[PDB]
Design a protein around this ligand. Structure first.
Ligand SMILES: [Zn+2]
Length: 56
RNA sequence: UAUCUG
C-alpha cells in the first residue's frame, strides 16, 4: 500500500499577481528585508522531491 | 487549515 493520511487534492495554479514583490522583499513569507533564498522560514531545500526530468 | 512566482 501507499498512503500518509487520506488527502486527495492537486492543483498547479495560474493567474496570481506577484503583489508588490520588492527587489528587496521576500517572495515566500512576504517579508521585507530578506530574500526568499534567505527566508528565515525556509527550513531546508530544495523542496518538492519530483524526479521529473522532462520539461526544459 | 501545505508561501522560494524575483
Ligand atoms: Zn521570507
Amino acid at each position: 500500500a501507499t498512503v500518509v493520511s487520506g488527502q486527495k487534492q492537486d492543483r498547479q495554479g495560474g493567474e496570481r499577481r506577484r503583489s508588490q514583490l520588492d527587489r528587496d522583499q521576500c517572495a515566500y513569507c512576504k517579508e521585507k528585508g530578506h530574500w526568499a533564498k534567505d527566508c528565515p522560514k525556509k527550513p531546508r531545500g530544495p523542496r518538492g522531491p519530483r524526479p521529473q526530468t522532462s520539461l526544459l
